[PDB]
Amino acid sequence: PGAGAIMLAMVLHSVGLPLTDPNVAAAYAMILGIDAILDMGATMVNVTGDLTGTAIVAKTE
Amino acid sequence: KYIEYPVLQKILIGLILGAIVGLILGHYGYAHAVHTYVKPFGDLFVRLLKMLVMPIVFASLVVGAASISPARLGRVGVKIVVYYLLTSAFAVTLGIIMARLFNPGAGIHLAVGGQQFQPKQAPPLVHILLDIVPTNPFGALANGQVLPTIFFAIILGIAITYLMNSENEKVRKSAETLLDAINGLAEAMYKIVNGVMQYAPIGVFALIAYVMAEQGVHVVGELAKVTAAVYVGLTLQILLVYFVLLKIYGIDPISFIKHAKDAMLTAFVTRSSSGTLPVTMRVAKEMGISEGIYSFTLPLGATINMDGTALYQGVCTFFIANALGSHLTVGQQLTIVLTAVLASIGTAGVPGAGAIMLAMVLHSVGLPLTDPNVAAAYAMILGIDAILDMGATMVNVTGDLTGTAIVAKTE
Amino acid sequence: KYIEYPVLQKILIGLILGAIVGLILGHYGYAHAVHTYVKPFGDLFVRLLKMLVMPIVFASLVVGAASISPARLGRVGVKIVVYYLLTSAFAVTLGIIMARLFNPGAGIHLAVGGQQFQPKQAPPLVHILLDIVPTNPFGALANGQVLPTIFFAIILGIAITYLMNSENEKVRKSAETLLDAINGLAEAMYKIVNGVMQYAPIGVFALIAYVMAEQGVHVVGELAKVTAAVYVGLTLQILLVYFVLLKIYGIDPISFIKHAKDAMLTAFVTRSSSGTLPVTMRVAKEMGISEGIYSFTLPLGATINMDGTALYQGVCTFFIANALGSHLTVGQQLTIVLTAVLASIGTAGVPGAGAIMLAMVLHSVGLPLTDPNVAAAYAMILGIDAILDMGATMVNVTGDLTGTAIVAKTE
Amino acid sequence: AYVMAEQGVHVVGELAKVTAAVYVGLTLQILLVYFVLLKIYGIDPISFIKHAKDAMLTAFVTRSSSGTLPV
Ligand SMILES: N[C@@H](CC(=O)O)C(=O)O
Ligand SMILES: N[C@@H](CC(=O)O)C(=O)O
Ligand SMILES: N[C@@H](CC(=O)O)C(=O)O
Ligand code: NA
Ligand code: NA
Ligand code: NA
Ligand code: NA
């Protein structure tokens, strides 16, 4: 759970914004407060696409 | 090589210039370049200004407690305290009354729902007290320790004094040799505090160079709203309270700022009351106040009386409760004042420790630091921080000087 | 009970005696027993000689900067600087030109082939300078800190001078009391520095008792050859550079070592410029140099001008390049100079910190320390180290007296 | 590829000589002690290395008895 929210950092760093700047971290924080609420829907489609990835490959094997 | 242009010209010249060099280089993303190249010159300034604090506070206080009555320290003190608290207490309610008039934080919707908790609290008072009495004064000196130094120099000056009215007039010889040389030092340091101060022009340019590059950019929207209510609030303390308390105690308000700036401007750009002190003290002397007063109301004020911190502490505490829509109202409004006085008395005398203190006052009301949106909002303030810190410090100091001058025109 | 046989007899007496007790005790495997039994006496000497460094450096400078014009400090400084750089940069070339003349390391076959890497570099200059300004000068004293101390006593001395030129003749009284009592101290230290130095005969005996015991036996084969190359390189800096710069500046070259040894025989046997300095300074005074010079050019050179270090740092860099067969040639020979200077300026004033710096100079050229045969070769030098360290320090110090006496004959 | 890259160059002077001393010492344990104890115990000395290498060429290159063991 939410290691994706921690990972969100990597993807932030790739573009401009760096984590050190208060308003970067200010916004990220807010997101870290809505996080497991996202994480729910997130995980249900991390797995649903794992099942469709299996079923449609074995329907071809 | 200037050769010597006047200082309050070059000082005020580098201030308005490096503020623009800083803001331009800052908003064009160079603030790191600025923190590489410029910064270390605005450092050397504060470096030299610190270098003096330890002798100049110890020396000047031995002398000044020798050249005043034990009776009168003890009156000037109880005076400065009950004046210090009253000024500090006013600055909070003058902050609440600015975040009520303005509205920073409101208009960023972000509420949250959990407290207190439980919570904790208790400043270990007993230990802070026993602590002003140092156990090696050589020690105390040797590593910062201004408050425990005070309580020595006061004890020493009082004892030398006593040595001079003693029967055997061999000791009164020694008693003089000591107190002369001690004054030798103190006097010397006030000469060095002019030395540095010809460096100030550079140091002042290169300080708001860096402070304006690396945090001007953040003065935006609802954060900008926190600046204005604080700034317009600090420059309302100056006018509504000091000039009034100077006028009332019949000391000239405009001649007072006429003493200056020197310490008003080293307070602003350094954002260090402790680093200011030498300059702060040399504008006590140069304005004629008595040494047995100013060398003990100013090193105590440099920590205990931070009107400018406990103002921003008021209005920052409002911003983070506004951004969450938690309306604070009767009881808390009143327990902000108490605790932001506390939090500033409180704060240390160095850069943005007032902001770190801001945590004690938040936790005092509902909101606790752990809750992401609490912290999200606090983080934002931690980006407008050094910009508040400047004005905060310049009033933390100007309230010390008016405190001094107004107590000493009664004594 | 000697009762008092002459000092340079009894110090030169235990020197040539204890080098023989030590080599006999050490090559017959006892060097442990000698670091048990003898050593605490060679120690107690360096103990006593340290004890003074702090007052004697502080007090004397205050006085010497008071007793001269701010102008002339500024002029004796820039001089001593551009002198010191120049002496140090020759000493590497005179070290290169000795490990070219001898051949230390070549004749041991051990090659390796991986560099640079990348590599790194940049002494943080900004911060070493800003550091010479201490922020607690009580502090700085209270713990070693010689360079920050210098930057105070110079500003204090200068401040006092100005106080004696002030209208109010009550502060001129205080000013005198101070500078007088301060000179009270300085003077006193110079008396105790004779106290010890009657102990030096024992101490010198008991220092090379040990350094020769535990490191003589290693002066063998390719290692003896770096010794010869450095030692013959060192007593040829003395002759070709000092005596020549002394003659030229019209000061008597033989009457100069005739000032001595004292500072020449504590520098050698302590291997500490910092522990010497009391004896280094007392033979600046005793030979008639003015205090407003020697109490500022001897504590600065005590760290900044290390001729004997920057010499063995060139010929040790060679030894390690030759043992690996890594030939250095055009570009590196010149950037050994630059670096072995930097590395000695550079080195700390205490035992074998120069052998520890040798690393910084190895990595400036190809070889990195990690590779087994670089470190194998470096390990051998760490066993000839305190033996090189002796002469090395004796010329670090001798290059500060000459640098002092030749600048003071110009001022 | 690597062990020769980062440690071949050092086999030089007195160091090459411990190499020679060990290496010629090791291929003389093989001959004088194994082949002889194999012969004597009536197992075929050349048919024994003929078992191999496999365990002889992972033992050499891994420098791990523990990592060899499966082979
Ligand atoms: N740096 C401030 C403290 C603060 O308000 O953050 C001062 O010297 O007063
Ligand atoms: N022992 C030397 C330092 C060195 O060359 O290792 C000194 O005091 O100058
Ligand atoms: N690498 C060796 C051990 C050794 O001789 O260093 C082994 O696996 O047997
Ligand atoms: Na203050
Ligand atoms: Na405070
Ligand atoms: Na030296
Ligand atoms: Na050095």
Numbering used by the authors:
A (entry chain B): 356 to 416
B (entry chain D), C (entry chain E): 6 to 416
D (entry chain A): 214 to 284
Question: How is this structure described in the published paper?
Answer:
GltPh, like EAATs, is a homo-trimer. Each protomer consists of a central scaffolding trimerization domain and a peripheral transport domain containing the substrate and ion binding sites.
When fully bound, GltPh-R397A crystallizes in the outward-facing state, like wild type GltPh, except that L-asp coordination is slightly altered because the mutant is missing the key coordinating side chain of Arg397. These results suggest that R397A is suitable to capture the apo and ions-only bound outward-facing states for their structural characterization.
